[PDB]
Specification:
1 chains, 1 helix, Parkinson's disease, hydrolase, Cryo-EM
């Protein structure tokens, strides 16, 4: 039930027990609340989608023991409850795009993919750095001052980190950067980066790296040539010091060139 003009709140009768409902879409309606009595009615729900509705704010804790994909993107949520996701120990993909969020409360450890781009995040919340299995993370278009180094993060399967359009100053990779070895994508476009760390060669499994639109950046480090798996490296609006106009725009050629620079340079 999507894109209809349903509102302001959907309340269900407790005498209706629907244990066979395993998807529930309510996006783009005129909802102004999470549907009441969602626990005892839809007892085993997999993927709840309340995108696009005009939700004022969460007050009651979910109780869905079987939730797997929660979605609250494009809403007017500003403050999230400290406990509204503690009774959902199977949540995997949580999305809260286009909101007014400021702080992320305690999340179940089974959360793997988490996408919270465009809200009002001033710094990475302490409750997101401690997820044991955090595969993907997207915090683009926030205002992140400094993301912590790899030693502070606890997850090991980190395989995507999106932080474009953020006021990040200095990428820290000195301390135990071998943790991030499995990172398969990393974006830092439109940031205040001054210099790419030389230890970037340790993140040997990168396939895409977007460091474009960083005017303060001048030149790539040599050791970057060891990232033989890269196939996408946009350089749009990047006044690079070392000349690569003769190379052109191919990424693998750039990486091979830097690789040759490693062995001997004159």
């Amino acid at each position: 039930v999507s894109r209809n003009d349903i509102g302001p709140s959907v309340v269900l009768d407790p005498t209706v027990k629907c244990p066979t409902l395993k998807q529930f879409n309510l996006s783009y309606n005129q909802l102004s609340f999470v549907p009441e009595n969602l626990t005892d009615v839809v007892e085993k729900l997999e993927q709840l989608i309340l995108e696009g509705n005009k939700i004022s704010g969460i007050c009651s804790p979910l109780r869905l023991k079987e939730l797997k994909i929660l979605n609250l993107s494009k809403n007017h949520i500003s403050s999230l409850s400290e406990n509204f996701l503690e009774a959902c120990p199977k949540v995997e993909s949580f999305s809260a795009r286009m909101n007014f969020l400021a702080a992320m409360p305690f999340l179940p450890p089974s959360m793997t993919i988490l996408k919270l781009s465009q809200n009002k995040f001033s710094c990475i919340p302490e409750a997101i750095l401690n997820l044991p299995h955090l595969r993907s993370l997207d915090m683009s278009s926030n205002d992140i001052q400094y993301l912590p180094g790899p030693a502070h993060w606890k997850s090991l399967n980190l395989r995507e980190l999106l932080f474009s359009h953020n006021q990040i100053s200095i990428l820290d990779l000195s301390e135990k950067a071998y943790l991030w070895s499995r990172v398969e994508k990393l974006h830092l476009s439109h940031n205040k980066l001054k210099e790419i760390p030389p230890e970037i060669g340790c993140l040997e499994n990168l396939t895409s790296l977007d460091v474009s639109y960083n005017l303060e950046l001048r030149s790539f480090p040599n050791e970057m040539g060891k990232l033989s798996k890269i196939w996408d490296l946009p350089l749009d609006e990047l006044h690079l010091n070392f000349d690569f106009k003769h190379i052109g725009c191919k990424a693998k050629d750039i990486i091979r060139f830097l690789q040759q620079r490693l062995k001997k340079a004159v």
